[PDB]
Amino acid sequence: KALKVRTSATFRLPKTLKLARAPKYASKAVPHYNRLDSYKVIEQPITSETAMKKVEDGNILVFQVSMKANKYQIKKAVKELYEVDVLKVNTLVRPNGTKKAYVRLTADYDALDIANRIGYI
Template sequence: MSPIFLQPKTLWLQKQPKYSRKSTPRRNKLDLYAIIKFPLTAESAMKKTEDNNTLVFIVDVKANKHQLKQVVKKFHDIDVAKVNTLIRCDREKKANKTGII
């Protein structure tokens, strides 16, 4: 049997710098008005709107589903049931929202 060498546990203290490394906090580039770019008005999108009660938008690529849900609820007064997203071949993000008006 070989000997076992144990490293003693040491206390890790939180860093307390003398000055801040950043002069100003980072600006949020993705505000509520920049998330949704425009609604999609293609024939397939219109069919989804009529048949499935679903809205289709072109949105910012960096936006996630929670942000999309909040924006649609705020600006369109719709309770969103589900959000589906995909990134199209032209590098735009498309979002489908099934909602209850």
């Protein structure tokens, strides 16, 4: 017979089969356990006299919160560690290089009430 019929002047790299990895020994024997769980995410209360104010007047809980952790993660690990519901979470890095969550609870909850359930005062 005879030849191909390429209508394009450009020759391109044949789109050839990409085989997926099916290994033979494992990557690491044991996967890592969860590196940022709810307990590691939210480290202590912040009971500064001016912070407590934000709890009586603010319906706001203030935590020293792991630097590795974003608002999403602060919100969950609060909601989870404490049964409470969260409105919004503002955050900030302190001058001693530790992160501070300003956690606002929804109106259904009283934070000041919830503060001294966890125990501080």
